[PDB]
Amino acid sequence: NREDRKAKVIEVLNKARAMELHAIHQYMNQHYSLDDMDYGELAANMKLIAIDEMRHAENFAERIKELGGEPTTQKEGKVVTGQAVPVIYESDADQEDATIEAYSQFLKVCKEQGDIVTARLFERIIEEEQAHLTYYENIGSHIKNLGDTYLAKIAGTPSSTGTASKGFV
Amino acid sequence: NREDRKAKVIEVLNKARAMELHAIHQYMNQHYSLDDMDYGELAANMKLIAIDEMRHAENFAERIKELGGEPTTQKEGKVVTGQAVPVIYESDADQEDATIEAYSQFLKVCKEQGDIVTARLFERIIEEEQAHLTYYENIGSHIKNLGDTYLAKIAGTPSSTGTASKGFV
Ligand code: FEC
Ligand code: FEC
Ligand SMILES: [Fe+3]
Ligand SMILES: [Fe+3]
Ligand SMILES: [Fe+3]
Ligand SMILES: [Fe+3]
């Protein structure tokens, strides 16, 4: 039934959205650590990736509203704090790869429920996740192979992500 | 699948409701004829049964709303007019028996859809439909076995169904 179809898509959309809220908090917590450690270029790209996750959360929420549902406000799982730099990139690569696997299953549900608009949304966001995955794998590999030589290059670099973002005040 | 289940129950509820809307118009059409004939007692009971059907239509509508549906406004089947007195009871008896058969089917769907509240609503209404059936069966029999001897007894009796209907004005 139509209603049936909508409910099942809203469910995978809220599951995905919950994963995005987790990622925002997880990535920003690592950003606070990298910034504190004064590894500016690393801190900056971590925050830019977090902002892509914010955009995903928002796109998911907007489609949930188009389908008449209520966007979840709760993140999936727990944020790991106090990770060492190698652990940050290893676990973030792991998480990105798991997110792509999950969204790929959610997409198939969309296809089964005859929801082309939502499946296209998953497809576009999955391609962004792949860009995130490649990034994290590359940094992990530099840290693996080069160690402190690589740290020494990032030490003291600019941490700016650009102009402060649009706000009300 | 909550939405499949609500949708399948709402479908038999709207089906039963359209059988009630037809019944209301069918029995009141016969009431106007009986009243015109001045067979008071028969006219009064025919309107009282119509009012019972109004209450069934309403109960079906309210449950449909609880389940998030839209109560139908269309009646099932055609109203037959100018029915003679023997045909009124014979046809009302047949229609009540057909309704009990239909609703026992609808009850079945409710139970299959795990809708206990709606199943109980049908069981309760089915027992009222049996009261109507018995009534029509008895009148048809008297008319068939005693003919005009029984009608002379009904002639000129009061047709009042009680105090005037609560209204806005
Ligand atoms: C959408 C959305 C969500 C999800 C909320 C939801 O419930 O769906 C959302 C969630 C969050 C959450 C948590 C945090 C808090 C992170 C933390 O401290 O753990 C959180 C934090 C930040 N957001 Fe965020 N967001 N977000 C935008 C949209 C969304 N954001 C847009 C747009 C911009 C654009 C800013 C700009 O262009 O200047 C933006 C920028 C930031 C900055 C950057 C500040 C700066 O450099 O000035 C920080 C920090
Ligand atoms: C419920 C409901 C429906 C279905 C509406 C829907 O679309 O769901 C509904 C539908 C109809 C329809 C047609 C008719 C018109 C019949 C015709 O003329 O063919 C129709 C006709 C009558 N209704 Fe009716 N109904 N109905 C109530 C509930 C419902 N009624 C309740 C309650 C009372 C309570 C009256 C009282 O207590 O004084 C009540 C009374 C009457 C009287 C009584 C007049 C009198 O003696 O003053 C007549 C005639
Ligand atoms: Fe994402
Ligand atoms: Fe990502
Ligand atoms: Fe009825
Ligand atoms: Fe009936």
Side-chain angles (χ1 to χ4, degrees), chain A residues 1-77 79-169, chain B residues 1-77 79-143 145-169:
Chain A
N1 115 324
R2 291 290 303 268
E3 268 317 299
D4 204 342
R5 283 153 68 206
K6 275 186 178 74
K8 283 150 146 154
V9 173
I10 287 163
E11 178 192 359
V12 300
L13 286 164
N14 263 320
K15 274 176 195 213
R17 183 180 153 68
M19 292 164 67
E20 299 294 342
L21 302 166
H22 174 260
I24 296 157
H25 291 75
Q26 180 66 82
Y27 296 163
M28 285 304 296
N29 179 88
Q30 290 154 176
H31 161 80
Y32 299 134
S33 300
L34 298 162
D35 216 345
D36 178 58
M37 289 172 244
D38 198 36
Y39 297 130
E41 195 197 10
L42 292 178
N45 282 318
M46 184 64 72
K47 171 166 180 191
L48 291 173
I49 292 182
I51 289 164
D52 291 348
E53 312 298 28
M54 297 167 206
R55 182 186 64 248
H56 299 160
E58 174 183 43
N59 294 144
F60 283 139
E62 293 172 318
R63 184 57 184 155
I64 284 161
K65 294 300 269 203
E66 280 166 11
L67 297 173
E70 195 53 48
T72 177
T73 57
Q74 273 194 72
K75 60 161 146 342
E76 161 72 38
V79 169
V80 176
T81 72
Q83 290 161 314
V85 170
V87 174
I88 289 173
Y89 295 99
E90 173 216 83
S91 70
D92 285 354
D94 286 354
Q95 188 181 322
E96 288 295 342
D97 175 272
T99 296
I100 290 160
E101 282 290 288
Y103 287 7
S104 298
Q105 278 136 21
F106 297 154
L107 194 156
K108 167 175 100 149
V109 158
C110 291
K111 285 193 199 150
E112 289 163 356
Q113 303 304 309
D115 195 347
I116 305 317
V117 171
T118 307
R120 290 264 47 245
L121 177 55
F122 272 113
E123 299 175 10
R124 291 188 180 120
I125 285 178
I126 285 167
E127 300 186 295
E128 305 195 345
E129 305 308 2
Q130 171 69 62
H132 295 166
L133 173 57
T134 289
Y135 173 79
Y136 286 133
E137 290 184 336
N138 285 345
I139 302 312
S141 130
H142 295 320
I143 286 161
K144 192 182 146 109
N145 293 325
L146 301 169
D148 287 351
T149 313
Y150 185 75
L151 303 174
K153 176 164 91 143
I154 308 315
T157 47
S159 66
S160 188
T161 55
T163 85
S165 276
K166 60 220 213 177
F168 176 83
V169 297
Chain B
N1 214 318
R2 298 299 291 278
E3 284 312 333
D4 173 54
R5 286 156 61 193
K6 280 170 173 69
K8 288 173 160 118
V9 178
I10 291 156
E11 158 161 24
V12 302
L13 288 174
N14 255 319
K15 276 190 207 250
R17 187 176 144 75
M19 295 166 76
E20 302 290 349
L21 298 168
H22 161 272
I24 295 163
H25 293 75
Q26 186 62 84
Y27 298 155
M28 287 303 294
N29 183 76
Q30 301 165 163
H31 164 82
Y32 301 126
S33 289
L34 292 162
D35 194 52
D36 180 50
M37 288 178 239
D38 195 41
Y39 294 130
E41 199 191 29
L42 292 174
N45 283 325
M46 187 64 74
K47 185 177 171 179
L48 290 181
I49 294 165
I51 290 165
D52 286 351
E53 316 299 24
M54 298 170 202
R55 186 182 66 246
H56 293 164
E58 185 180 29
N59 301 137
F60 286 134
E62 301 171 313
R63 180 63 182 153
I64 286 154
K65 293 298 281 186
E66 298 179 349
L67 296 174
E70 197 56 47
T72 181
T73 60
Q74 315 216 246
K75 58 205 169 267
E76 177 74 354
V79 175
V80 177
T81 71
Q83 292 161 306
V85 168
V87 170
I88 287 166
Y89 295 100
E90 206 200 1
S91 75
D92 286 359
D94 282 344
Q95 177 187 319
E96 289 290 339
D97 180 80
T99 293
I100 288 164
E101 288 285 279
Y103 292 1
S104 306
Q105 293 174 30
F106 297 161
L107 208 165
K108 206 165 124 141
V109 170
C110 293
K111 277 166 141 175
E112 278 155 13
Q113 301 309 316
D115 194 345
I116 300 311
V117 171
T118 306
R120 286 289 301 135
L121 173 66
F122 272 109
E123 283 175 24
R124 286 188 179 111
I125 284 180
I126 277 163
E127 289 177 276
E128 313 206 341
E129 308 296 8
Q130 177 74 58
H132 300 157
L133 175 58
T134 294
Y135 173 76
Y136 289 135
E137 281 189 339
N138 289 346
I139 302 301
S141 290
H142 293 318
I143 281 151
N145 299 327
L146 319 175
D148 281 341
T149 315
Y150 170 77
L151 289 182
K153 160 162 99 154
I154 312 307
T157 44
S159 38
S160 134
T161 53
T163 183
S165 55
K166 61 196 153 159
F168 182 79
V169 300

